[PDB]
Amino acid sequence: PSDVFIGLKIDQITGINQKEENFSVVGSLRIDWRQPLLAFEHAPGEPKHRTYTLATFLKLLEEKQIRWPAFTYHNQQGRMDFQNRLISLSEDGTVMYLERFTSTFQAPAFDFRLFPFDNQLFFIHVDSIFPQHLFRFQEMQGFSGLGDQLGEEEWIVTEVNTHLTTHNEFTKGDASRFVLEFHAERHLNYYLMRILIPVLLIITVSWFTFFLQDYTKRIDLAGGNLLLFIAFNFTISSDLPRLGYITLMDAFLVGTFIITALVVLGNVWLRRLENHGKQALARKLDIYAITSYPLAYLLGALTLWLLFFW
Amino acid sequence: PSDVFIGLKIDQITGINQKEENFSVVGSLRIDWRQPLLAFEHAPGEPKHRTYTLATFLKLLEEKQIRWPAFTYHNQQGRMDFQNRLISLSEDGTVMYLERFTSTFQAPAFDFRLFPFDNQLFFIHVDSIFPQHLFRFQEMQGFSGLGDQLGEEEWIVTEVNTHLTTHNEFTKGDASRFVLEFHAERHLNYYLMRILIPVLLIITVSWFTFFLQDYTKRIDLAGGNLLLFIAFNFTISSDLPRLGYITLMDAFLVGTFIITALVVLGNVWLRRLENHGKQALARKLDIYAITSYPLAYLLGALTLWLLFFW
Amino acid sequence: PSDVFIGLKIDQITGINQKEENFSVVGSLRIDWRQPLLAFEHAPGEPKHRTYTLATFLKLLEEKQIRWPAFTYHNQQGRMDFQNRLISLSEDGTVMYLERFTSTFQAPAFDFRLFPFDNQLFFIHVDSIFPQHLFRFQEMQGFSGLGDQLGEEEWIVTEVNTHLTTHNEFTKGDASRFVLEFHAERHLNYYLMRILIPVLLIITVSWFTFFLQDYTKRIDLAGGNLLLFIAFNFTISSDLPRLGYITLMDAFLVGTFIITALVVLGNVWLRRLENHGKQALARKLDIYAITSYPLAYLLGALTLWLLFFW
Amino acid sequence: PSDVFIGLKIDQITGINQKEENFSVVGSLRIDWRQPLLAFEHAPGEPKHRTYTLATFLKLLEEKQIRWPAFTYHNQQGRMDFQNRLISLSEDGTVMYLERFTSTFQAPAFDFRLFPFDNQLFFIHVDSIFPQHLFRFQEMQGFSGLGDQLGEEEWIVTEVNTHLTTHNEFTKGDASRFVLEFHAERHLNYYLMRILIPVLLIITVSWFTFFLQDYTKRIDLAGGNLLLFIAFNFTISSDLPRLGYITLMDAFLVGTFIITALVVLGNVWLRRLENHGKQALARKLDIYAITSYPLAYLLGALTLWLLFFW
Amino acid sequence: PSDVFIGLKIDQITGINQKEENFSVVGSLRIDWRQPLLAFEHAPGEPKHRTYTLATFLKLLEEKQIRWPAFTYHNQQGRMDFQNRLISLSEDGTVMYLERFTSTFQAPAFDFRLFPFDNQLFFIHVDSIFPQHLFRFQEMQGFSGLGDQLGEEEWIVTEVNTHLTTHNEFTKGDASRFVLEFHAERHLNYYLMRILIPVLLIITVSWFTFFLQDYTKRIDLAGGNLLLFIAFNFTISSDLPRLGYITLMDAFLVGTFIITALVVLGNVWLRRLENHGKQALARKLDIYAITSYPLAYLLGALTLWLLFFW
Ligand SMILES: CCCCCCCCCCCCCC
Ligand SMILES: CCCCCCCCCCCCCC
Ligand SMILES: CCCCCCCCCCCCCC
Ligand SMILES: CCCCCCCCCCCCCC
Ligand SMILES: CCCCCCCCCCCCCC
Ligand SMILES: CCCCCCCCCCCC
Ligand SMILES: CCCCCCCCCCCC
Ligand SMILES: CCCCCCCCCCCC
Numbered sequence A, B, C, D, E: 001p002s003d004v005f006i007g008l009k010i011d012q013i014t015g016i017n018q019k020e021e022n023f024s025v026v027g028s029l030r031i032d033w034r035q036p037l038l039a040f041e042h043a044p045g046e047p048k049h050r051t052y053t054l055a056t057f058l059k060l061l062e063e064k065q066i067r068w069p070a071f072t073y074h075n076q077q078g079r080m081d082f083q084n085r086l087i088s089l090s091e092d093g094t095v096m097y098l099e100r101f102t103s104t105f106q107a108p109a110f111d112f113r114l115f116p117f118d119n120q121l122f123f124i125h126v127d128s129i130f131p132q133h134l135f136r137f138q139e140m141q142g143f144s145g146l147g148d149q150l151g152e153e154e155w156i157v158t159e160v161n162t163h164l165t166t167h168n169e170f171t172k173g174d175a176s177r178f179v180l181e182f183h184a185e186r187h188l189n190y191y192l193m194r195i196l197i198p199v200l201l202i203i204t205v206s207w208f209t210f211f212l213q214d215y216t217k218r219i220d221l222a223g224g225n226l227l228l229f230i231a232f233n234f235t236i237s238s239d240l241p242r243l244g245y246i247t248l249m250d251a252f253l254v255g256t257f258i259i260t261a262l263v264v265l266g267n268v269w270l271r272r273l274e275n276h277g278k279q280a281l282a283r284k285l286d287i288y289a290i291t292s293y294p295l296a297y298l299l300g301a302l303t304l305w306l307l308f309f310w
């Protein structure tokens, strides 16, 4: 068998789609191979290295009746665009190949249930067409990976890896597979500032209602604080992804709605007790409401942690 | 006639469009066929199996003057993209074919009137071009179907099937048709949490208004609860599909609007009776309102069930 | 001249664009023609009918130096995609042609001023390239039209027609034109439920304000009902098309805004009369307001009917 | 030099993009030219005029070694789609050419500062490749322009023109340029109904606050009218183009916000004077507020006219 | 080595994408080169300059076995569209080349943390394929740059530059690189009018609450001013870019929310002190609130300046 050295490098992640579950990149694929049948002596005044396009070089190989180690991108989505496809040929028969491209790729491992605390997995598979007794992939050391970013991005890359495996077609011979994989995360700082801090203030305004004496005014104030929560919710709607299943962020907001609505219902009942002449009993229930309100939020937090992270 | 064995497998459902009524996939089409005229003996040192691209192989067939069993995708929409198209040729004349693609498909059976409790039907048709006395489709057993999903999705597949039929063109000979079909559903859990629970609380706040004594304050509170319902409605608008016809979900929300508006009108009339000095009569009508309000919702639920599910 | 029989059938209307004024379809074009110069006798064991692709068949015609009746789609927009293009050739020289496609088409007749009560006209033109003394179109009977729909759609087709005309280029010979045209409408049921019923309730709440005694409370209630109308308006914005000209629906909503705003202004003036000590006069004007409010809506309806439907 | 007669006609304006500054059309390009070297005598039974596709005809010209007057579209954007490209050849050597297309075009002259009272300029440039001593453009009279529209549109065309100029490349010979240009406007009727009338009512409600006696109630009413203005503003947001610079419409709405906010601040100060026991002074300032409020709007209108239209 | 003179000019910036980090243009690439092997004498009556398309000219070079100085666009994104590709050939062997195109380009340097006061960097790289001892780039003086704009735009260009560098592939010979770069900014005038002025008025209304005597009314007014801020926030949402990280504009709006919410909480506590009979102490704390409110905004401004601009 003949050894083929291969590597892949990604310049830039050009987009990520959370609803369709795919991602897009710009990158470069490189292969080194040696074929002694291609060795030559340069003509008088000719340079020491010959250069062809892939279209030009494949004709040369067909005129010599030489087999090319062809390969394919197994999780590609749609059409792929090439910026350049270039070949250098050595005096000794060494072939150096390079192709540079733009493309989209399938991402079947995406899972957003722990949003915004989620970490996602990305990969690209390259497959040999011929079986492993003709051609065997070897890992080109030093080349493969991701380049550095230059401004400010949405996703932060945490880990990068490459390894070699096999695949099979037509129930015959196994063939080589090359894998590049990486992991990435969000800026949690941004969600603290945009969502948590203002919701905590809204929660505080609802608690402060128990500090006043007239139940009539309380009903007005509690009602208005529920409309304020709803108004805020649509103001953040563009930061929430459109998914047909439940997230941690969804559970948090619905639970806040439930507790704030219950404050309206309680103050109506305290007014009813006052109208029936049971002021002292209503005054006693008020004292229990003040202390149990923060305990309800603390026990809800604990519940969400158990259901989503264990 | 000559037997052609065929099968189709879908890796991933890459999108679903409810307004245009189409869907998109990535998959693989496989065909086995035997043609003794293609049998050969391998050259000294040559492998036991020959491999060509479809473009290369069709030239070989034309040089031998052999007919190829050509086929077409009958509900395809737009252009189809190919990732690979590959042929293996056996010593005995057996041809193995494989094509891997991305494409969109028409979906004329979609019907969303029972949303969110709806179940939808999907299919793909593959048609033979030549008539059934030249070539006959046979079902390749073990291959066809859907692969497993790996994270969390919007639609859950409930059933998968394949079968064989016929089609006709130019009022001449019948020709074979191959069908793959499947059924899928939503996560109802998500709609319970996002829509039902908060609407039930809003309905409860409107009922609690009948517990208070001053009709003047009631009018204020009932009015504000109607604006709260409208505000909530636009907060959920992104979860509702843009269709030009009536759904079960539409009927549910309009009915809730009607009943909450009627509470405003009733409390104005009770205030009018008080101003004309008919307090005792107004106090009697109030007692009938308290009990009939929940009965109206229960009888509305029953009505919706009859109109949509029977 | 030589007779060419032609017909067109549409499977599915794949989209309609109200702002750009175009529509999209999937369909099939069929032509029958006879050319005795193409008659043949089948070889020993050959089938009685020969089959070619369009690319293959045109070469045969060029080798025999035979003219093909070429045609073009005159209101096509953009690029057209072909799913299949197929030819059957009879022993007697009869040619049967079929092409199946996806495409978008221009729609210059669209006019939405009577929305939602509007009915729109659609058409497709097919033109012969050669003049009518070489080739003449004849209508293929039984084939042309629209197929049946299978679930639930936005637009309902009301009428379908085909006929033959002529066109002219280079101020020379007239040439044949084939026309398919159809008409379609909306589900008015949907707009009754989504728009009319809730607006009628909002109008009723504004009338009920005249039933109360304290002008001070009336000003509060009338003001809040105007904000409720504005809130509802944005909740329906996605059902309204984005057009740069006036519709019947636009006129209806602006008129409702005018009348509800005038109720706020009137109640402020009644409070001013009370402050200046003219209660009896203010009480008299109130009685005229109660009866004239419904008359204003009835006379507005009559006005809109005259301006838009006559 | 050889005279080339040229003309251009546009059927339909298929879209206009205000943020990207481009427009799209469907149209037809026509050229007449005479070349005696192409004269011929028709064969026995042949028609008097020969017809070719552009691909076919250019081969004929190359076999005779004849130069074709090639041209290019100088402000084209992206790819252009052709529906038909057709050639008629006369017995005397006269060539008649026709191409029919869909395409997008650059629009660098767009300027929206006077919105909605703006009038915009559109153009298309066609350039000769060869210099003017080989080939000279002449204007084909009677053909060029715009066709009639058939329903109801967003933009109304006010003026259409064509003329001839020159261009230069490689600092050598001047070459011909053909220009078609036109001007268009909006329906102002639509903006009167959708924006002006309701804003004028909101302005009137704010003035009516000065007619009441209790400053306490005034503060409530003035505050609520400011929230009503904000609510209305988002209801019209879809009619406003997304531009990164100031328009006349923007200035109008911000000025209305400023004046309505100032009414809230004034009524708080009048309440402060009442609390400090200076009722008579506060009552005097109220009389000045009533008359100066309409004068502020009149002087603002005058200011906007001077800044934008002079 | 052979000198190649190169230059690039951009007509129009056709779009800018802040979320994907790319931009689009229309422009023209020009190259001058001399090759004595191409010198010729013109035939009797032939013009003094020959003209070919790139496809035509490359054939001529292959028939003479002459090497072409090929090049590539190194940060191109997707497919590039050509409007024209043209060659002039001089009697003395001088080649003049021109290509005119539409395309999108990668923009990895974008960084929006200082929005709206940000200034962004753009560039385009052109790379030689052959190494620098065959061909060397030289800068074509007078040609390169940006053209003038004609109406009103979103971005204003502040600086333009070109320079020459090198690049390396296959660890062999260095090759030439040509760079064009430019810088651009926003209209700050627009953001002053749309965001700052109305927020400053909202801030002023919240301060004026401390001028009134009844804490009961203050709580109502402070609550309503918080809902007004939230309503305004969604009215401007379309002017804010959708980025997953914190901007200066984000920090400004969250800080305003915090301070306005704190006014609601303070007035509830002053009412509690009044109910417990500590009016004089509450009256004293009120005097400290009036002066410290503006100081909080001034010190917040200073803090934001330090964190973002130093
Ligand atoms: C960070 C902004 C969103 C906060 C969501 C928190 C809801 C879940 C509470 C339990 C968190 C468990 C620790 C990870
Ligand atoms: C599940 C969230 C939406 C609930 C809609 C229920 C409206 C229909 C009531 C009758 C249901 C009949 C049982 C399927
Ligand atoms: C059907 C929902 C919209 C109703 C619009 C009615 C406004 C026009 C009133 C006059 C109608 C004339 C009869 C067609
Ligand atoms: C027509 C609807 C928008 C009205 C905008 C008017 C603001 C400018 C006032 C001065 C107009 C000057 C006359 C053209
Ligand atoms: C210009 C409209 C937005 C204003 C944002 C100002 C917030 C930052 C305050 C400190 C500015 C420092 C001077 C550049
Ligand atoms: C979180 C809701 C607290 C409600 C406080 C009032 C409780 C009233 C209940 C009366 C029936 C026991
Ligand atoms: C949180 C809502 C509290 C509702 C309490 C209802 C208690 C019902 C008691 C009935 C006694 C007559
Ligand atoms: C669901 C609406 C209940 C209305 C309660 C008040 C009924 C008043 C009707 C007076 C006329 C009979």
Ligand SMILES: CCCCCCCCCCCC
Pocket (backbone or CB within 6 Å): B262, B265, B266, B269
């Ligand atoms: C739900 C609205 C109740 C309206 C009841 C109106 C009854 C009209 C009676 C007229 C008697 C003078």
Ligand SMILES: CCCCCCCCCCCC
Pocket (backbone or CB within 6 Å): C259, C262, C263, C266, C267, C269, C270, C285, C289, C293
């Ligand atoms: C539809 C508006 C009705 C207004 C009712 C009050 C009329 C007051 C007018 C006083 C001046 C004649």
Ligand SMILES: CCCCCCCCCCCC
Pocket (backbone or CB within 6 Å): C262, C265, C266, C269
């Ligand atoms: C619908 C608004 C009614 C306004 C009536 C104004 C009447 C002005 C009369 C002035 C008398 C001093």
Ligand SMILES: CCCCCCCCCCCC
Pocket (backbone or CB within 6 Å): D259, D262, D263, D266, D267, D269, D270, D285, D289, D293
């Ligand atoms: C348009 C704003 C009018 C304000 C009316 C009240 C003026 C009060 C000013 C007191 C200080 C001179």
Ligand SMILES: CCCCCCCCCCCC
Pocket (backbone or CB within 6 Å): D262, D265, D266, D269
């Ligand atoms: C439109 C707002 C009016 C504000 C008037 C303030 C006048 C300050 C005078 C201070 C005197 C103590």
Ligand SMILES: CCCCCCCCCCCC
Pocket (backbone or CB within 6 Å): E259, E262, E263, E266, E267, E269, E270, E285, E289, E293
């Ligand atoms: C910006 C918030 C100002 C709050 C004014 C009232 C302060 C009350 C604090 C009482 C506890 C010290």
Ligand SMILES: CCCCCCCCCCCC
Pocket (backbone or CB within 6 Å): E262, E265, E266, E269
């Ligand atoms: C800005 C909010 C002010 C809250 C002040 C709380 C002070 C707590 C003192 C407790 C004394 C019993």
Ligand SMILES: CCCCCCCCCC
Pocket (backbone or CB within 6 Å): A251, A252, A255, A256, A296, A297, A298, A299, A300, A301, A302, A303, A304
């Ligand atoms: C339905 C799950 C209840 C979650 C309560 C939310 C509490 C979160 C505390 C931070």
Ligand SMILES: CCCCCCCCCC
Pocket (backbone or CB within 6 Å): B251, B252, B255, B256, B296, B297, B298, B299, B300, B301, B302, B303, B304
């Ligand atoms: C117009 C149909 C009335 C439907 C009433 C809604 C009641 C739903 C109860 C769950």
Ligand SMILES: CCCCCCCCCC
Pocket (backbone or CB within 6 Å): C251, C252, C255, C256, C296, C297, C298, C299, C300, C301, C302, C303, C304
């Ligand atoms: C400006 C046209 C006035 C239209 C009034 C609307 C009344 C509609 C009654 C159904």
Ligand SMILES: CCCCCCCCCC
Pocket (backbone or CB within 6 Å): D251, D252, D255, D256, D296, D297, D298, D299, D300, D301, D302, D303, D304
């Ligand atoms: C900042 C420019 C002030 C414009 C005032 C608006 C008045 C318009 C009167 C119709």
Ligand SMILES: CCCCCCCCCC
Pocket (backbone or CB within 6 Å): E251, E252, E255, E256, E296, E297, E298, E299, E300, E301, E302, E303, E304
């Ligand atoms: C969290 C950063 C606090 C910023 C306060 C905003 C003050 C801006 C003054 C113009």
Ligand SMILES: CCCCCCCC
Pocket (backbone or CB within 6 Å): none
């Ligand atoms: C801003 C937080 C104040 C907490 C007050 C607690 C009173 C018991």
Ligand SMILES: CCCCCCCC
Pocket (backbone or CB within 6 Å): none
């Ligand atoms: C939260 C549900 C309370 C139900 C109260 C019923 C009173 C009759």
Ligand SMILES: CCCCCCCC
Pocket (backbone or CB within 6 Å): A290, A291, A294
């Ligand atoms: C009277 C107020 C008591 C506050 C207790 C708070 C316990 C969390």
Ligand SMILES: CCCCCCCC
Pocket (backbone or CB within 6 Å): none
């Ligand atoms: C729900 C319609 C009630 C109509 C009341 C009419 C009173 C004059």
